[PDB]
């Protein structure tokens, strides 16, 4: 990267102006250029540039990212002063913690909740199961109950988790890898909702953050779900709009993955000096901050000078509310699997490509093992079974074994990717030296058109402990 110039890079939904603005104030100063974008995707680019010494100087995301991040080594230890430390509430500095070192410097606290149109409907609903009933009566003025983003599993995980769906268990003060709340009887029944809402038509299965904040914006929609960032362009609407509780469901709240807005510096940067000065001394400032949230809203700031003004702005305060009743994203590495697992499930059974079982089964053995079985719907073409670590620190998978129908095989656990094939039995390459054969066919009680194939799974741990899994694949009769 350039030296004598910081690049930065912060999600497109964020204060990028404001931040711009900050950056041409330091410009201005210092003489130093400032320049921001907003690539698409930037949680999946930024480790995949960093790791060949480019990318920008600063890069801005919640804090759940940053532990894989900082597992490859892509980011410098911040090491500020303890007059700055004392700037901002330390549970913010918690959040940016990372084997003890902190990896980034902690801005703002985000949590999605419920935003309404007080004119179509000055009293919310405080239930999921309500929205429905309210569908059918809005449906007849030509509106929709509700509408938000069901592309990103960011969105949906706080009805999944009501019932009592999570990531990774939290035991004393740290998170058991080992423990994956995916494939629960709460999860199930939340996704089950979600995808009943679908099916009865009071949601749309293709909706995405653009559609869903079009439909709201313009009052096609009485609701939907989104965070800080999203209320100012609802100021420019016409819209009056409340912000409040997520409903409840099956008398439970909605729980939200609490985000950090976090600023990481680049381990790759010649520029860090020049970086810290930036962020504390400039964009962690009442101005700054003013800046950035005047564009944007930030939700909950880390500054504390500000946040005591902000307290005052009760939209902040509704944040903070679906906030305590969430619970703050883990920073570990393997929540990039986690993601990725659920984001699938959600997608597929919203599609109706996956019974919601299946769908979160697979997820289940994804998030937990990295593991992803690919299956052809022809029998003739073969499934394949990817490993995929994504964790390479602390307890971790050291052994693997496959148990196919005709003996046991092992897969290792390197850093990479691990592939094999998996054969359905009666092809004509079902028995050959080498291949691995399904257990199967097995009826499937809700459908008659369907055969399950399975293949199971023992994994060693670094600790001793095994675990097993399964993998499913599902075939048309
Ligand atoms: O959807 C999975 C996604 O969830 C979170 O991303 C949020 C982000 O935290 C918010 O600041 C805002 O930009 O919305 C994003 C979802 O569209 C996680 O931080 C991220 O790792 C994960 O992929």
Same mark, same amino acid.
């Given at each position: 990267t350039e030296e004598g110039k910081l690049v930065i890079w912060i999600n497109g939904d964020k204060g990028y102006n404001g931040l711009?603005?900050?950056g041409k104030k330091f410009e201005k100063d210092t003489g130093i250029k400032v320049t921001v974008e907003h690539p698409d995707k930037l949680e999946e680019k930024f480790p995949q540039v960093a790791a060949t010494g480019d990318g920008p100087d600063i890069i801005f995301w919640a804090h759940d990212r940053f532990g894989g991040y900082a597992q490859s080594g892509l980011l410098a230890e911040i090491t500020p002063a303890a007059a700055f430390q004392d700037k901002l509430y330390p549970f913010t500095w918690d959040a940016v913690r990372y084997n003890g070192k902190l990896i980034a410097y902690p801005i703002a606290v985000e949590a999605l909740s419920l935003i309404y149109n007080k004119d179509l409907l000055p009293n919310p609903p405080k239930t999921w199961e309500e929205?429905?009933?309210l569908d059918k009566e809005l449906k007849a003025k030509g509106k929709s109950a509700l509408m938000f983003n069901?592309?990103?599993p960011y969105f949906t995980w706080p009805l999944i988790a009501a019932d009592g769906g999570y990531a990774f268990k939290y035991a004393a003060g740290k998170y058991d890898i080992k423990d994956v709340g995916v494939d629960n009887a709460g999860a199930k029944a939340g996704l089950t909702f979600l995808v009943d809402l679908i099916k009865n038509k009071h949601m749309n299965a293709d909706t995405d953050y653009s559609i869903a904040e079009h439909a709201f914006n313009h009052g096609e929609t009485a609701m939907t779900i989104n965070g800080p960032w999203a209320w100012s362009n609802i100021d420019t609407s016409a819209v009056n709009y409340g912000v409040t509780v997520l409903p409840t469901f099956k008398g439970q709240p909605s729980k939200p993955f609490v985000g950090v807005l976090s600023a990481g510096i680049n381990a790759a940067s010649p520029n860090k000096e020049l970086a810290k000065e930036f962020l504390e001394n400039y964009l962690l400032t009442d101005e700054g901050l003013e800046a950035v949230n005047?564009?944007?809203?930030?939700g909950a700031?880390?500054?504390? *000078?500000?946040?005591?003004?902000?307290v005052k702005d009760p939209r902040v305060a509704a944040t903070m509310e679906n906030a305590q009743k969430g619970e703050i994203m883990p920073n570990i590495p393997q929540m990039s699997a986690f993601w990725y697992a659920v984001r699938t499930a959600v997608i597929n059974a919203a599609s109706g490509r996956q019974t919601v079982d299946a769908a979160l089964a697979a997820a289940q053995t994804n998030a937990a093992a990295d593991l992803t079985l690919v299956c052809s719907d022809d029998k003739s073409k073969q499934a394949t079974l990817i490993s995929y670590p994504v964790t390479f620190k602390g307890h971790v998978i050291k052994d693997m074994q496959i148990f196919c129908k005709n003996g046991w095989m092992q897969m290792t656990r390197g850093r990479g990717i691990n592939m094999i094939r998996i054969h359905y039995p009666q092809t004509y390459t079902s028995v050959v030296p080498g291949a691995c054969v399904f257990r199967g066919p097995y009826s499937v009680p809700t459908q008659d058109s369907i055969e399950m194939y399975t293949? *199971?799974?023992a994994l060693l741990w670094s600790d001793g402990t095994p675990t097993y899994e399964s993998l499913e694949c599902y075939v048309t009769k």
């Open positions: 711009a603005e900050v929205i429905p009933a069901l592309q990103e005047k564009d944007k809203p930030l700031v880390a500054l504390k *000078s500000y946040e005591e003004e902000l293949v *199971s799974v």
